[PDB]
Design a protein around this ligand. Structure first.
Ligand SMILES: Nc1ncnc2[nH]cnc12
Ligand SMILES: Nc1ncnc2[nH]cnc12
Lengths: 285, 287, 286
């Protein structure tokens, strides 16, 4: 019944520290030390995904990061991800509480289970049709409302209500491997598929969190229009850094409010269901 | 002169298709196969059976040694490989309980060894660029389809039949699979995209098995089982999958008999000639 | 001054000085390199698949090949690639000066930088919206005009004005990992996405050339229709080689003219912009 919130911070990334934990996992070392402490009465653990941002997205040890948070007793993970927009409604400065993704990563360790010595014993086939924890998604959305940040829900709001900057209540991300950005050809193809944003760090992090029995939700920071618009609006690293810094302030407020909103509810049945889903997805029984 | 290898997928972890005459615990130049190989006969036709995931289904799709499985069967003198694959549906007319004799695929796998050849010392010498436009052995595909007819299973061919001939359960006489890496299932977003591309089913094990079989000079065909990777429905899906396994077992046993009733000398030679004609290094030297 | 590398050499046009073996921080290049001159312009020729054509596309050391040309002082790289056509107006014997691509390769070393000891220390996030050097693209096209080869621009001209064999003034490529050719299902999917050609070797070569601060342009050689047409037109090795041997003399004329055209212009601002793009993409330093 205990609740403990892990926070995985991307580009641009909270409380007074109780302890710094140098941990190891059976999958290797996490990206950095883990800082443990409290937000109000809620226990919380913070972990930077890139550790002085020297580790590219394809080389982050997502297994060790998620497992380390599980081993410190986290029940939830809140994650941030920098991204580029593929659609006109999503402009730099907006946020997206994602609910879908398309995976184009490769060469990353994306599961804890297998038949090799470097993995846990078993064959795990996890359902991923709706790959995030829906309860935690709505917490992020309500947190933005409580902090007087606009929310745009395309299902129930006219397009004229999309007042920027705003938090988009839904969205799909294509995760590319990096480190290069997309070509205009690739951006047009992803947009034609109906995708909303492009990023590099969401997958396999989201999949491993569900394998570990954790509730996971992501808030993406729109820093650019990818490269499907005008040449002045094409992505570079400086464009990504120049927008993260301005938006980090507001995503901090959202994260800290979401931690408090998580602590204000009972999660006994959701945590139980997270664990049961893993056990029922074991094909080796 | 024929010998039929069988690679059993989910539902065939311990097949027992015939009385075991002998066993082969072997390795290959590309590592260990998934399990020991079981030898026997269907009538007078030699047969060898190998569970793709191992006896206890301990090996996930991404970690299956497709190269060792295909090579071990080639080493034993197999001329054909029949494989089973459990799949999910992406289209309205493919429903749980149906079967598909695949003729096409779209590859979204990565990180698997998918060729016997290359420039590394542990690969076979040479560069092989195989044609894959119609990646299966068409003659063996038609034997699987005829075996279903002979076992009283409906066959639906959307090229010549209207949709009212789609009577379930049925063998779809053609179809395309997207092969994904796994182990996780697809998101709704990914499934929507694969459906929009026109793909019929989704699976995790077809590729690179089919590609390696053609590299090895073997006639390969796959029969896929459509199941449901989803009030209560799990018990009905499992009973339905059990019934599908019994049907596929009947199809496999009849197909081995049908293969054995014909001569394959020309087709086997054509399979070997196709490998040689795809050796880029040799054809560059030829000119 | 400039110096042109050619990744993919007659007597009266290429004055061969010598053959060179080099090493790089990322291993050995595919083969030794031929150093020479086209007029007064220094030129280096490097075959992608090595001696005996024993190296398949997925195992080519693109990092070593590009870095070796960088270390020898090249300012430009011109590349040729055989390819299959996905569209009716691109026919065997044509050429394509690509301007776009979609990447379906995996497991290749595609960046010089990273956190492993096998790569240079750092994190490079390169923009790739328009991944080629446009000035060098337009030289390849103008080289074709100078050699009396037809040029077809589908933005300006009409399908009824396409004269073969022609250099297509733009186009997009899907790069697949190989070694196998595509299925018919994959071919039609790529065609439906709007792609023009399919190949195996463009990526990561084009990406690493930009990482190295070099101007890179590719002219593809259409050898086949992949496998979206009739059975006698489905791709195979013999078909690819038969057409390649007949088109290679035209593409040799283009590349030799392009090298002389590059030498006739100043590239000071372009080269400086190439290097400034690399440094501004170094996340670890910013
Ligand atoms: N366009 C983009 N593509 C990938 N990752 C990004 N991060 C920020 N913008 C991005
Ligand atoms: N159809 C094709 N596909 C991939 N690479 C090729 N190279 C030449 N033709 C090709």
């Amino acid at each position: 019944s205990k609740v403990k919130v892990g926070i995985i911070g991307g580009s641009g990334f909270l409380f007074k520290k109780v302890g710094v934990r140098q941990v190891t996992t059976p999958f290797g070392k996490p990206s950095d030390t883990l800082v443990e402490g409290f937000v109000g009465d809620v226990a919380c653990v913070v972990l930077p995904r890139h550790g002085g941002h020297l580790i590219p997205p394809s080389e982050v040890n997502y297994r060790a990061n998620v497992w380390a948070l599980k081993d410190l007793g986290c029940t939830h993970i809140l994650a941030t991800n920098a991204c580029g927009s593929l659609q006109e409604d999503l402009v730099p400065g907006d946020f997206v509480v994602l609910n879908q993704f398309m995976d184009k990563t490769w060469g990353r360790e994306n599961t804890f289970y297998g038949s090799k010595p470097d993995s846990l014993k078993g064959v795990l086939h996890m359902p991923m049709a709706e790959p995030f924890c829906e309860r935690t998604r709505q917490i992020l959305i309500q947190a933005a409302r409580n902090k007087s940040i606009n929310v745009y829900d395309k299902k129930t709001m006219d397009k004229s209500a999309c007042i920027h900057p705003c938090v988009h209540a839904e969205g799909s991300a294509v995760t590319i491997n990096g480190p290069r950005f997309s070509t205009r050809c690739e951006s047009f193809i992803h947009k034609a598929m109906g995708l909303d944003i492009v990023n590099m760090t969401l997958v396999p992090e989201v999949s491993l969190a569900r394998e570990a029995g954790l509730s996971y939700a992501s808030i993406a920071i729109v820093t650019d229009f990818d490269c499907w618009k005008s040449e002045e609006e094409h992505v570079c690293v400086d464009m990504v850094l120049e927008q993260f810094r301005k938006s980090v302030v507001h995503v901090r407020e959202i994260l800290l409010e979401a931690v408090a909103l998580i602590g204000a509810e009972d999660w006994t049945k959701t945590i139980e269901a997270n664990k049961a889903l893993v056990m029922s997805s074991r094909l080796d029984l």
